[PDB]
Symmetry: D2
Subunit: 160 residues, 4 copies
C-alpha cells in the first residue's frame, strides 16, 4: 500500500522539519527509512537526480525527499515508488520568487493522497506569510540562499 | 486584505459542501457574498467564463467558485479579485480521470494563501480515496456526470 | 474497524455542515448511515434524541453514526466508545466550550478516546478576525440556553473580554 | 494579540518536533522566544511549575511548553500569558495510558484558538495510532519512559 504525501509552503515555514517529523514516526515503529536531499543546497543521501539514488530507495519502505522542486524527475520517481508500495513524503516550495510553479512539483498534486501547504511568518509585517520574496536582483530561478537572500512574505508585502 | 483559498480533492469528497461552509461563516457575520457555479454542470450565479460575472463580483467582499477547473480564466480572475481586497474561495478537482492536472487550476497553488486536499471513500474497496476513475470509455476531458459515470477510488483500485 | 471523530469549534463555525460532509462521503459509497440530533434544539435547520441510549437499537444496525451537538448528551462518552468498539464509525460535532469558556458537559472526555480531533474556526462578529469562542449576549446564567445569533456571538479573545 | 495553540497526540507522534517547528517560525522572524520543558523528564528552560518561570516568560513574545500535561498550573499560566499578548504554544499528551484526560490539559481546549491532534504509527500493527499503551504493570499516572515502557497503538491493539 504505497502513497505520496506532499508538504508545500514558502521558505521559512518548516517544511523540512515537518518532513522529518513524519519520517521519524515510521522509523520509531521499525520501518526502514531513507531521506534524500538536493546536493546543491549546502546551507540523508545527497542527490541531483532521484534516479541516481533509486537502487537505495528500492530497499526501503519510507522515502523522504527534501526540496523536491529541484529534482527534474520528481514525478516519475514518486509515482513509481508509490506504485511499488513505498510511502513517499515530499517537502517542496510550491512557488518561485515570482509566485509561479516551481519546476514540475505541482504535477505531484493530482498523484498525491495527501497535500498540505504550510505557512510562514511575514518578515516585513509579521502576519501570516504564504510567499517568498527575493531580496536581490538576480533573475534566474535557482539561487541558493537563506534569510540573507529571501524573505517570507504576505500578499501585501510581496507587492510593496 | 484579499486572499485565495483552494479546496482540492477527487469527486465525492464534499468540496462544494466545504466551500459553502466557508462562505456561510462570512455571510453569518454580515459579509456580502457571491457564489459562482459552472453553468454546464446540470446534475448562486451560473457562468461559463468568470469575466461574464466580474461586475457582480466587484460589489461583494467574499467570492466562492465551485468547479473552478472548468473556467479557463480562473487564475487571472482570482488573482485580480484577491489583489482588489476580496476573499476568493475555490473548490476544484485537482486531477482529471487520467490523474493529470485539470485545466489551469494548479497555477492557483503558488498564488494561494491556503490550500487543502480533501479525501473521499473508495467506492470499490472502501478505504480512503484520492482519485477519480471514469467508468465508461469516453476520452475527452469534460464529461459531466456523477456516480453513474465516475467512482472515487484509491491508488490500488485506480489501476485494477 | 471502529473509530471516533470529533469536530469541535465555537458557534457559527460550521460544525454541523462538516459533520454532514463527512457522513455523506460514506453514504455516497453505499454505507448505511444514521444522524442523531439533540431533540431540544428545535432551531430552524435525522433522529431526534435526548439520550443516546434511546436510539441505541437504531445505531446498532448502521455502519456510520453522526452526532450533532454532542455536548448535550450526558451519555456521549459511553455511547461513542461502545459503538466504536463494536466496529462503527462515530462522528461527533460539538461545542468544546460554554459561554464561560469552560468544558461543555462531558464532551472533552472523548478527546483521549478519539482517533481524530479538529477544532473549527468562526468569524468574530464584533471585529471580523478569526473567532475561537462564543459570547452570550444576555444575562442568563444557566449553561443550557438554546438560541442562535440573536443570543450569541462568535468572538475572538479580545472581543470576548471587551 | 495573544493566543493559545495546543498540539495533542499520543506518544511518538512528534508533538515536540511540531512545537519547535512552530516556535522556529517566529524566531527566524526576529521574535523573542522561550521554550519550557518539564524538569523531571530527562530522556530550553527546565521547570516543575510554570510560575517558577513566569518572570522569564514576561520578557518574551512567544512561549513554547513541552509536556504541558505535567504542569498543574498549565491553564492559569497560558491564559494569563495569552491575555498579556503573548503567543503560547503547548505540546501535550491528551490521554494517559488509561485513555483518560491527562491532568488539567483538556481545560485548555475551550481557551485555545488552535487545537490539533497528531497521530503516531501503531507499533504492533503499523496502522495509524491515536493512543499510548503502557507495557509494564505500574499503576501510577506519572512514569517517565520511552519506547521501552510504552507503545503508540491503534484502538484494536490497545485492547488486545
Ligand atoms: C523562492 C526560491 C528559493 N530558492 C532556493 C533558496 C533555498 O536554497 C531553497 C529553499 O529551500 P527550503 O528548504 O524551501 O527553504 P527553508 O529551509 O527556508 O524552508 P523550510 O524552513 O520550509 O524547510 O530554494 C531558489 O533557488 N529560487 C527561488 O525562487
Ligand atoms: C474526474 C473528472 C470529472 N469530470 C466532471 C464530472 C463532474 O460533472 C465534475 C466534477 O465536479 P465535482 O464538483 O468535483 O463533483 P462532486 O459533486 O462529486 O464534488 P464534491 O462532492 O467534491 O462537491 O467534473 C470531468 O469532466 N472530467 C474528469 O476527468
Ligand atoms: C455557547 C453555548 C451554546 N449553547 C447552545 C446554543 C445552541 O443551541 C447550541 C450550539 O449549537 P451549535 O450547532 O454549536 O451552534 P451553530 O449551529 O451556530 O454552530 P455550527 O455553525 O458550528 O453548526 O448550544 C448553550 O446552550 N450554552 C452555551 O453556553
Ligand atoms: C502515556 C503516558 C506517558 N507518560 C510519560 C512518559 C514520557 O516520559 C512522557 C511522554 O511525553 P511525550 O513528550 O508525549 O513523549 P514523546 O517523546 O513520545 O512525544 P513526541 O514524540 O510526541 O514529542 O510522558 C506518563 O508518565 N504517563 C502516561 O500515561
Ligand atoms: Mg530547507
Ligand atoms: Mg461538487
Ligand atoms: Mg450546528
Ligand atoms: Mg516528547
Ligand atoms: Zn506582510
Ligand atoms: Zn479502493
Ligand atoms: Zn474580535
Ligand atoms: Zn494496531
Amino acid at each position: 500500500r504505497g502513497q505520496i504525501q506532499v508538504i508545500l509552503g514558502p521558505m521559512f515555514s518548516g517544511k523540512s522539519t515537518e518532513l522529518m517529523r513524519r519520517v521519524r514516526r515510521f522509523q520509531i515503529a521499525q520501518y526502514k527509512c531513507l531521506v534524500i536531499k538536493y546536493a546543491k543546497d549546502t546551507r540523508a543521501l545527497p542527490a541531483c537526480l532521484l534516479r541516481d539514488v533509486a537502487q537505495e530507495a528500492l530497499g526501503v519502505a519510507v522515502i523522504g525527499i527534501d526540496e523536491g522542486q529541484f529534482f527534474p524527475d520528481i514525478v516519475e520517481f514518486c509515482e513509481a515508488m508509490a506504485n511499488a508500495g513505498k510511502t513517499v513524503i515530499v517537502a517542496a516550495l510550491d512557488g518561485t520568487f515570482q509566485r509561479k510553479p516551481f519546476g514540475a512539483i505541482l504535477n505531484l498534486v493530482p498523484l498525491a493522497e495527501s497535500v498540505v501547504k504550510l505557512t510562514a511568518v511575514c518578515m516585513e509585517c509579521f502576519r501570516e506569510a504564504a510567499y517568498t520574496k527575493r531580496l536581490g536582483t538576480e533573475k534566474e530561478v535557482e539561487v541558493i540562499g537563506g534569510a540573507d537572500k529571501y524573505h517570507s512574505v504576505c500578499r501585501l508585502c510581496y507587492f510593496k
